[PDB]
């Protein structure tokens, strides 16, 4: 039984104190969908070059938007597709962008009337197409914030979906998550996707700012457009769950020593373990609170976290055999 591990560390400077970051891989290159707001707001498409992020486009200037929007990126081997959708301030309006080089995006605008997610919360994320019987689908998924009462499984996690790139969003996709608690409330739900495998990553707890616990749910087919999803555990003593990814059909799972995130652990198949200790040379405490995986392929993946200024620590993680 072979195991090969290697760890690299690279730093990146960003002149933009992005309110929220959204990395994705296209070609071999790394990209970020930055959001800057504090009157005027920017959605930069930055790209990693040598040692620093390089802004390439301000999608948001095409606007006709009012304020901060939900962002939905979808990356294929062929072309990136980026949607800028208004959140509720009643049928959805979005701006579609697409590029087959990562540099020159083409503009478009779409409207989905009577849209399936009419009373659901949404959060921005990056994603990959979901193959289904020779039909790949982009999913915009929304979760009900918190359920006060009556037991019902209808739309605890609802998704509307498109198989024509981003152009039309007709299809409905139902998720049956067989779980409930009274004061529990979900946040930041995103679909992890790998081949045909659908999964969801979200935070649980009472209403936002006091979120703590991570939850992850694998999904399996019931119909062509209906999934049943059961919770998958990842708890470890004196460690807080952080993020989940796959390498070679195996899980790689990060944790922190506790909620202050002084150190981060990477766990390969819950067998091998790596410790990332952030070196500190600033008056600010160094930590890995934002750390997230960015899959490259079945062997390589990144672990990224920012710090005091726009200093993106980036661990290049190799693990194979």
């Amino acid at each position, epitope marked *: 039984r072979h195991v090969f591990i290697r760890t690299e560390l690279s730093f990146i400077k960003n002149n933009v104190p992005c309110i929220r970051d959204m990395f994705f891989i296209y070609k071999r290159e790394l990209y970020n969908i930055c959001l800057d707001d504090l009157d005027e707001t920017h959605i930069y498409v930055q790209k990693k070059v040598k040692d620093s992020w390089i*802004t390439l486009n301000d999608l948001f200037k*095409e606007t006709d938007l009012t304020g901060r929007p939900h962002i939905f990126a979808y990356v294929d081997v062929e072309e990136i597709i980026i949607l800028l959708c208004e959140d509720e301030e009643k049928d959805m309006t979005c701006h579609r962008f697409y590029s087959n080089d990562g540099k020159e995006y083409n503009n478009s605008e779409i409207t989905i009337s009577d849209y399936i997610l009419k009373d659901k919360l949404l959060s921005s994320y990056v994603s990959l197409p979901l193959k289904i019987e020779n039909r790949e689908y982009f999913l915009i998924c929304g979760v009900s914030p918190y359920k006060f009462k009556d037991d019902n499984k209808k739309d605890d996690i609802l998704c509307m979906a498109s198989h024509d790139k981003g152009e039309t969003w007709g299809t409905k996709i139902v998720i049956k998550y067989d779980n409930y608690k009274l004061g529990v409330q979900y946040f930041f739900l995103r679909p992890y996707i790998s081949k045909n495998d659908l999964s969801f990553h979200f935070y649980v707890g009472d209403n936002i700012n006091n979120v703590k616990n991570v939850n992850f749910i694998e999904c399996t087919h019931e119909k062509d457009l209906e999934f049943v999803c059961s919770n998958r555990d990842f708890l470890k003593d004196n460690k807080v769950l952080q993020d989940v990814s796959t390498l070679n059909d195996e899980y790689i799972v990060s944790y922190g020593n506790d909620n202050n995130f002084a150190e981060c652990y990477i766990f390969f198949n819950n067998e091998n373990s790596i410790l990332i200790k952030p070196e500190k040379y600033g008056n600010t405490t160094a930590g890995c609170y934002g750390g997230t995986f960015v899959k490259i392929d079945e062997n390589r993946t990144l672990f990224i976290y920012s710090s005091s200024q726009g200093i993106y620590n980036i661990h290049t993680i190799y693990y194979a055999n």
Partner: antibody
Amino acid sequence: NVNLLESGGGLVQPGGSLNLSCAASGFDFSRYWMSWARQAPGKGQEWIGEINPGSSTIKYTPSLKDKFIISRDNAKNTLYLQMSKVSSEDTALYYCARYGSYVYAMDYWGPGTSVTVSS
Amino acid sequence: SIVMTQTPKFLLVSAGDRITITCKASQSVRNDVAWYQQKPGQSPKLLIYFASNRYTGVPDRFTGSGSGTDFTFTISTVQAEDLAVYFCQQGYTSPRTFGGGTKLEIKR
């Protein structure tokens, strides 16, 4: 092949009014942001203002906010700058310019046209 | 209103020489900076956008860089056609103010 042309320049007495037009052709005029800038003699470029294709978003330099007003007609492919209550500071060569795709930069300038304010 | 201080102002140099103007802003302006050239008798032409990107059709000799407060514009091999007035502009927020300009003339 992009082309712009300014019009309406000339002399105007101080405290007066003047209209400036900019015709555009060779590209989709309703597809791009538009902007005004100006050059005082012997001095660097001064940005004036900008407007989005739907005219919903118009922005000015703070000094000119109550003097000039920018507008555009997509049906006529024309940008407009309405000036009034001018003083000697406004004597300048005025440029109208297009923003580039996904950039707040002037990717194409017109030749401009002169404006002089004197008694 | 942000202010853009440009150093230097006059540059006299021979052909084949490198040059590098710098532009310092009063506040952080992220990566949004443009560099323009206007040859005498000409309207300004765009050359650099987002501090370090070529515009289409821009010859390779022109480059830009810098972070945060400060930025640089650079010509690798100055030519007689490059006699001109170069200047920076901040695109981060309105007003999108220009710099003071930099005349560039050549030895012969």
